[PDB]
Amino acid sequence: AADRADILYNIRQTSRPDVIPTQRDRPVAVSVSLKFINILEVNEITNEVDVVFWQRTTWSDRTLAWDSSHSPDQVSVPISSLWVPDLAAYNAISKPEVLTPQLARVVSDGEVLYMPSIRQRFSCDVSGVDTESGATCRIKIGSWTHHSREISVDPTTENSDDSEYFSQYSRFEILDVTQKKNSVTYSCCPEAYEDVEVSLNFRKKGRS
Amino acid sequence: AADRADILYNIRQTSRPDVIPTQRDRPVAVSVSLKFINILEVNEITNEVDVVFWQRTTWSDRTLAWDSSHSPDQVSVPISSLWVPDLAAYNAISKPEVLTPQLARVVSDGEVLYMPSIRQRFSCDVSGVDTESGATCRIKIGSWTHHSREISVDPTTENSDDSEYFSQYSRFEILDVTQKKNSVTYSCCPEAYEDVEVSLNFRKKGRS
Amino acid sequence: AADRADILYNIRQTSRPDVIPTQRDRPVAVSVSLKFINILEVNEITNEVDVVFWQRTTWSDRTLAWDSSHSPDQVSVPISSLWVPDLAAYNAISKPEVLTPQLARVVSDGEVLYMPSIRQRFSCDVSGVDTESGATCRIKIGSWTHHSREISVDPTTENSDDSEYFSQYSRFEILDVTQKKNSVTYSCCPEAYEDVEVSLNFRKKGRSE
Amino acid sequence: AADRADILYNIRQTSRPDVIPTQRDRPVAVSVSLKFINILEVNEITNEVDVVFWQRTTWSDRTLAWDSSHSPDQVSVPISSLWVPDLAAYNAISKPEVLTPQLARVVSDGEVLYMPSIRQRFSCDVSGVDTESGATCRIKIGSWTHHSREISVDPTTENSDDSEYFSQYSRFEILDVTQKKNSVTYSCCPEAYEDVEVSLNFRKKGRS
Amino acid sequence: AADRADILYNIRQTSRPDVIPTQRDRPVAVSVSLKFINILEVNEITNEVDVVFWQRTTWSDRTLAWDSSHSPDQVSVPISSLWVPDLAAYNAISKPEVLTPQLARVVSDGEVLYMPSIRQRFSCDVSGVDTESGATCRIKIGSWTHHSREISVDPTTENSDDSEYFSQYSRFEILDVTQKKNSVTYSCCPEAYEDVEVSLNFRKKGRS
Ligand SMILES: N#C/N=C1\SCCN1Cc1ccc(Cl)nc1
Ligand SMILES: N#C/N=C1\SCCN1Cc1ccc(Cl)nc1
Ligand SMILES: N#C/N=C1\SCCN1Cc1ccc(Cl)nc1
Ligand SMILES: N#C/N=C1\SCCN1Cc1ccc(Cl)nc1
Ligand SMILES: N#C/N=C1\SCCN1Cc1ccc(Cl)nc1
């Protein structure tokens, strides 16, 4: 006998947008997977690439779960009412442009899902973009302030073609995508920051 | 009898901008109709266009109804005070730029109307743009987080000149526009999201 | 005797920035006139132009009035503290960049004056810009959501210098400016929306014989 | 004997940012002085300059005064918690861009000092910019809505080096900067609006 | 004992973001160090550069400390909840483009750390950029409204590779980075303003 309104209110009433949902005291496991949608502006001279991708972000806050037996099992919730991982693109050279409604999806089991479409410039290896082997641009995305003990990242290795959602009208094509997990520490501080290194192998389509 | 100040006050009193106005347990009937007003920047090599259209969006929210017997049966309300469908252009390469005041129109029966002027850039086939056959750019629009069970999108099929309000000073011209109802799915979830496929057909206005 | 501090306070109470001050059942009369200040990037190929102009907007909101007997009859108030017409440029291709402070002038008789300096890009006939007759760019401005029964727009046309405030350093010169009242009923709905057509006639300077 | 916290706490308890601090009924003596920091862009053909400057602005608001005989007599406050003069550049062709933190300095005696660094484009005389005598670009800054009786603008004309803080790396050089006062009346209304006409005599750098 | 929610809750219970936390009556010690990431745009004619760096900002705020005996001694906190130094690059010709989540790291002892990746444009010496000895662009950063007796800025001599995080895909390379502590007094007031001067010696790459 619970409607979507009741569900939302319960989330607001128990969620803390500025507090990380640390269960017991292990880190919060965040899953991050990108699905390239397009590759626009490209410069082999400056090694800069403009790209659009759907950043599928998933985690969980069990303090928000309800009984979906006779109630909706999911609801969209403004991300501002929810705690969202402070993910950041380490080699980005421009703020991310969120092209889609900043709405998240909360599941009755406490699972939270946020998958916005983002356009952002990157500084990566662009050389070879016009060769057969193409170029390989690596994008590192992970928490900015939360280290491993508090946040952990892992690619969603679920099956899905590299360019499953890639634009056909794009001047380029995706050869292969490989989302690996990686760590990043600094000469100052001990704790390491987990990230996902996404390698996008793409090249310029040549007319026959 | 109550006036505008009362109605508006009451609307703001009962509007839940973050909760989908699901009457009973059926999707919200959102009708979408794009009205191309101009076609600016256009590139055939990168398949990219900059368009200005009026996104006529329509839906109902019974919770906002009231007796208009002896009072205004229509008022302008800030879309921030209302729940608004979370639409997105699945093939947009730039966030939508609302060029007009973000005001919606509310009718006593609960029929909400919002139609803003939006300039945006999409990724689409532009080939032939400089021919008599012209180019056909297809733009899909639908909810981003709400599937068919939560939201339905049907093109407000209004038989009208596809260029009824299209600038005459544009370097291009419309041959014909068609808006079909549609949907998409992904490799993660069974739920399908309804959209609208506005197929634009235009070519550069030859200089004769 | 009340001061400006009070006048403002009392105004923030009776003011409803989201409620159009209709008089009984009389549409709100809003006067709109542009005072062109400059003409920048003029692309005769895309029929696009960047214009800077002061938009003098007037209207009355009795619910704002007060006793100017022993108090100032005029004060400057933030536009968010009161209702403001949802004017728009129907043929604008860029958002209206407001260059000046967004404050309006309020008179104890409820008369409201708002005159912002705006930088904006429109789509219009730019052809002929480099000819003796020049080009004639028409800008259509009106309420976006309030139709004729709610908002009535009329240009405060009066024998004035069309280029009175136009920049002398501009690459262009104003041949003539005319503001006409118009109306548009969309083939969807009955209500007719009022607007003002400002036809700007201008050309490049330093032309040949 | 109060402290920073008290001084601020009290400011918001008395400050009215929307109310001009008119003592009795004499206008607010606001002083404006520009300190040109750079000249980034200049168009000889279209008569437009893009410049950077520090806008030293001073006025008084005794309703914010406090006894600093046993506490600081100066504190930095966000201009958002204070009333501020509604100055504008009558010949500005782009909205002002404040590069520095929007903070003012309030002295225990009610004196207020706000000096932001600004990047802005103006329409002015560029002719002669490439000659030994240089060009003269006048910039008129005054209140946008408060006529002479409410606001008065007077430049603090003293002995200061015109290009004292001017960047040595700019492509131009300051020849002289005279800051005169002026009154601007309108063919609409009787009262005039006091303004300050800053004359920036500069030329392009080009020695032997 | 307490959770992260308790920590933050209390932080916002005693934090005065608009008040400088001057321990006793002495200036706040703000440590500032730049960690260069990239050198994008460069114009030797206009003497302007586009730089991306991590501004490692550090200071202490005793009004936020708490017991971490059986609780965490660190949390990520939105900077909107803390007081933050009003730092500003003097020769910056564009406002800072914060590319990362605006979160600060606070320790149980009141230590605060904020390291935002920033993309910004400066007016400095670009001459020789294309020579072997490269160019030396000096960047000056310090408080904007707080003088030496309120805020003191000093570069953490944390020796390390100057191009430790510098992108290897940049068109340029770092030859040397030196960060000296300096001071500046303006012909307005006797109070001096501390700042750090970061000299970045770089050049365009190439092949031997
Ligand atoms: N996979 C998947 N789902 C996708 S890809 C592009 C849009 N969607 C639908 C969606 C699903 C969930 C959320 Cl939080 N946001 C968007
Ligand atoms: N069709 C239609 N209506 C149009 S086209 C240009 C202006 N209008 C009026 C209008 C009517 C309703 C709303 Cl929510 N927004 C705008
Ligand atoms: N005419 C006129 N008035 C002008 S033109 C440029 C500045 N002014 C003063 C003014 C007066 C009132 C308002 Cl709301 N805005 C500006
Ligand atoms: N003169 C002076 N003061 C200057 S020039 C550049 C920075 N400063 C310090 C300052 C002092 C006070 C305020 Cl409100 N703003 C800036
Ligand atoms: N040194 C260091 N730390 C770095 S360099 C790039 C990211 N980090 C982690 C970090 C740590 C703390 C804060 Cl407030 N912000 C960022």
Report yes or no on chains D and A touching (3+ CB pairs under 8 A): no
> What tokens does B190 get?
């069974």
Distance, first Cα to last Cα, chain E: 62
Interchain contact, D40 vs E48, CB within 8 Å: yes
Residue type, C189: C
CA of D119 to the centre of ligand 4 (A): 16
Nearest to A158 by CA among B189, C85, C36: B189
Calculate the alpha carbon distances from C181 to A59, B138, C31, E140 in Å. Answer: 58, 38, 11, 56
Which of D35, D38, D99 to mutate against chain E (most E CBs within 10 Å)? D99
A119 contacts chain B (CB < 8 A): yes
Give the 3-state secondary structure of residue A81.
helix
**Ligand closest to CA E75:** 5
Calculate the alpha carbon distances from A105 to A81, A191, B90, E63, E94 in Å. Answer: 12, 31, 18, 37, 37
Tell me which chain D residues have a C-beta less than 8 angstroms from the C-beta of E145: 76, 101, 103-105
Interchain contact, D94 vs C98, CB within 8 Å: no
Nearest alpha carbon, ligand 3 atom 1? D188
Calculate the alpha carbon distances from C205 to A169, C39, C138, C173, D193 in Å. Answer: 44, 12, 20, 6, 31
Q: Sign of dihedral through CA atoms E201, E203, E207, E208?
A: negative
Rounded to a whole number, what is the distance in Å from the CA of E80 to chain D's nearest CA?
A: 13
Q: Give the number of residues written for chain B.
A: 208
Q: How far apart are CA E20 and CA E82, in angstroms?
A: 10
E44 contacts chain D (CB < 8 A): no
Beta strands in A44-165 (DSSP E): 48-60, 74-78, 87-89, 97-98, 103-107, 111-114, 117-123, 135-143, 151-154
Is ligand 2 within 6 A of the CB of residue C185? no
Instruction: State residue A12 phi and psi, 5-degree precision.
Output: -55, -50
Give the 3-state secondary structure of residue B5.
helix
Q: Among E115, E118, E159, E161, which is best to mutate for testing ligand 5, by the most ligand atoms less than 8 A from CB?
A: E115
Using CB atoms within 10 A of its CB, is residue B9 exposed (0-12), middle (13-18) or buried (19+)?
Answer: middle
Tabulate helix, strand, coil % of chain B (nearest 5).
5, 45, 50
Q: How far apart are CA D130 and CA D203, in angstroms?
A: 6
Bridge partner list, E43:
E48
B144 contacts chain A (CB < 8 A): yes
Q: Which residue in chain E has the smallest CA separation from D103?
A: E145
Q: Helix/strand/coil (H, E, C) string of chain D?
A: CCCHHHHHHHHHCCCCCCCCCCCCCCCEEEEEEEEEEEEEEEECCCCEEEEEEEEEEEEECHHHCCCCCCCCCEEEEEHHHCCCCCEEECCECCCCEECCCCEEEEECCCEEEECCEEEEEEECCCCCCCCCCCEEEEEEEEECCCCCCCEEECCCCCCCCCCCCCCCCCCEEEEEEEEEEEEEECCCCCCEEEEEEEEEEEEECCCC
Tabulate helix, strand, coil % of chain C (nearest 5).
10, 45, 45
Element (H, E) at A199: strand A189-204
Interchain contact, C45 vs B171, CB within 8 Å: yes
Query: D151-153 and D28-43: which strand pairing?
Result: parallel
Nearest to B91 by CA among B44, B45, B141: B141
Q: How far apart are CA D195 and CA D181, in angstroms?
A: 6
The region, left, alpha or beta by phi > 0 then psi within -120 to 50, assigned to residue E37 is alpha
Query: Which residues have any ligand 1 atom within 6 Å of their CB?
Result: A 54, 56, 104-105, 113-115; B 144-145, 186, 188
Contacts of residues B180-183 at CB distance under 8 Å and 24 or more positions apart, as own/partner, are: B180/B155, B181/B153, B181/B154, B181/B155, B182/B140, B182/B142, B183/B142, B183/B148
Nearest by CB: B93 against A101, A105, A119: A119
Ligand 5 atom closest to residue A188's alpha carbon, by position in its atom list: 1
Interchain contact, D101 vs E144, CB within 8 Å: yes
**Ligand closest to CA C145:** 2
Q: How far apart are CA E120 and CA E38, in angstroms?
A: 11
Distance, first Cα to last Cα, chain D: 62
Which of D19, D28, D44, D83 to mutate against chain C (most C CBs within 10 Å)? D19
Q: Report the CATH number that the domain containing residue B109 is assigned in CATH.
A: 2.70.170.10
Q: Which domain holds residue A37?
A: 1-208
Report yes or no on chains E and A touching (3+ CB pairs under 8 A): yes
Tell me which chain D residues have a C-beta less than 8 angstroms from the C-beta of E16: 5, 8
Note whether A201 and A174 are within 8 A (CB).
yes
Report yes or no on chains B and A touching (3+ CB pairs under 8 A): yes
Residue type, D11: I
Q: How far apart are CA C64 and CA B13, in angstroms?
A: 24
Query: E151-154 and E28-43: which strand pairing?
Result: parallel
Report yes or no on chains B and E touching (3+ CB pairs under 8 A): no
Note whether C173 and C203 are within 8 A (CB).
yes
Is ligand 2 within 6 A of the CB of residue B105? yes
Is ligand 2 within 6 A of the CB of residue B104? yes
Instruction: List all residues 6 or more positions away from C67 whose beta carbon is below 8 Å from its beta carbon.
Output: C2, C108
Q: How far apart are CA E98 and CA A49, in angstroms?
A: 19
Note whether E161 and E176 are within 8 A (CB).
no
CA of C109 to the centre of ligand 3 (A): 18
CA of C114 to the centre of ligand 3 (A): 8
Give the 3-state secondary structure of residue B60.
strand
D107 contacts chain E (CB < 8 A): no
Nearest to A167 by CA among B125, B189, B40, B193: B125
Distance, first Cα to last Cα, chain C: 66
Q: How far apart are CA D189 and CA C8, in angstroms?
A: 23
Tally of domains within chain E: 1
Tell me which method was used to determine the 3D structure: X-ray
B&C contacts, CB < 8 Å: 64
Q: Helix/strand/coil (H, E, C) string of B101-148?
A: CCEEEEECCCEEEECCEEEEEEECCCCCCCCCCCEEEEEEEEECCCCC
Q: How far apart are CA B65 and CA E174, in angstroms?
A: 66
Which of A14, A19, A25 to mutate against chain E (most E CBs within 10 Å)? A19
Q: Which residue in chain B has the smallest CA separation from A105?
A: B145
Q: How far apart are CA D174 and CA D160, in angstroms?
A: 13
Calculate the alpha carbon distances from E19 to C198, D11, D53, D72, E14 in Å. Answer: 51, 12, 27, 13, 11
Instruction: List all residues 6 or more positions away from A8 whose beta carbon is below 8 Å from its beta carbon.
Output: A75, A77, A81, B18, B19
Instruction: List all residues 6 or more positions away from E60 whose beta carbon is below 8 Å from its beta carbon.
Output: E21, E23, E28, E29, E110, E111, E112
E182 contacts chain A (CB < 8 A): no
Give the resolution in Å. 2.7
Nearest to B91 by CA among B48, B56, B40: B48
Q: How far apart are CA A175 and CA A159, in angstroms?
A: 16
Residue E199 exposure: Cα atoms within 13 Å on the Cβ side: 11
D95 contacts chain C (CB < 8 A): yes
Nearest to B179 by CA among B138, B136, B120, B134: B138
The residue with tokens 């979507």 is A4
> What tokens does D22 get?
């008119």
Bridge partner list, D140:
D197
Q: How far apart are CA B43 and CA D37, in angstroms?
A: 40
Q: Which residues of A51-78 are buried (b: 16+ CB within 10 A; e: fewer)?
A: bbbbbbbbbbbeebbbeeeeebebbbbb
C77 contacts chain D (CB < 8 A): yes
Rg over CA atoms, chain A: 19
**Ligand closest to CA D54:** 4
Note whether D193 and D183 are within 8 A (CB).
yes
Beta strands in E44-192 (DSSP E): 48-60, 74-78, 87-89, 97-98, 103-107, 111-114, 117-123, 135-143, 151-154, 172-184
Residue type, E14: T
Ligand 4 atom closest to residue D117's alpha carbon, by position in its atom list: 6
Q: Cβ atoms within 10 A of the Cβ of C155, count?
A: 18
Interchain contact, E164 vs A144, CB within 8 Å: no
Instruction: State residue A90 phi and psi, 5-degree precision.
Output: -60, -40
Q: How far apart are CA A17 and CA A15, in angstroms?
A: 6
Q: How far apart are CA E202 and CA D160, in angstroms?
A: 35
Q: How far apart are CA C109 and CA E122, in angstroms?
A: 51
Note whether A80 and A17 are within 8 A (CB).
yes
Note whether A16 and A83 are within 8 A (CB).
yes
Instruction: List all residues 6 or more positions away from E65 whose beta carbon is below 8 Å from its beta carbon.
Output: E108, E109, E110
Nearest to E35 by CA among E155, E146, E122: E155
Rg over CA atoms, chain C: 19
> What tokens does D127 get?
């002719």
> What tokens does C115 get?
């005159």
Instruction: List all residues 6 or more positions away from A123 whose beta carbon is below 8 Å from its beta carbon.
Output: A47, A48, A91, A92, A93, E38, E167, E169, E170
Note whether B201 and B135 are within 8 A (CB).
yes
Tell me which chain C residues have a C-beta less than 8 angstroms from the C-beta of D48: 40
The region, left, alpha or beta by phi > 0 then psi within -120 to 50, assigned to residue B152 is beta
Q: Cβ atoms within 10 A of the Cβ of E132, count?
A: 8
Instruction: List all residues 6 or more positions away from B122 whose beta carbon is below 8 Å from its beta carbon.
Output: B48, B49, B51, B89, B91, B92, B93, B137, B139
Nearest alpha carbon, ligand 4 atom 10? E145
Element (H, E) at E193: strand E193-204
> What tokens does B193 get?
């999201």
Q: Which residue in chain D has the smallest CA separation from C171?
A: D46
Q: How far apart are CA D90 and CA E64, in angstroms?
A: 46
Residue B26 exposure: Cα atoms within 13 Å on the Cβ side: 7
